[PDB]
Design a protein around this ligand. Structure first.
Ligand SMILES: [Zn+2]
Ligand SMILES: [Zn+2]
Length: 44
DNA sequence: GCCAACGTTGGC
DNA sequence: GCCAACGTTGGC
């Protein structure tokens, strides 16, 4: 697993949105879509 | 042991 | 080609 960059706009966000697939569907095991690190959205 | 969330992949 | 679902790690 890679680590989030910590400094992109999504990484800086503190709150989960509550409304995306991640936030409403905890079965996904994903971070809030608005918080997903821009670096991690690119495949290795 | 809990909890958050990354990597993979099957289903579309 | 995308992404929801699952298995898994890794910080604590
Ligand atoms: Zn969200
Ligand atoms: Zn980031």
């Amino acid at each position: 697993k890679r680590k989030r960059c910590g400094t992109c706009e999504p990484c800086r966000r503190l709150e989960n949105c509550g409304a995306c697939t991640s936030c409403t569907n905890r079965r996904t095991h994903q971070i809030c879509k608005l918080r997903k690190c821009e670096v991690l959205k690119k495949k290795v």
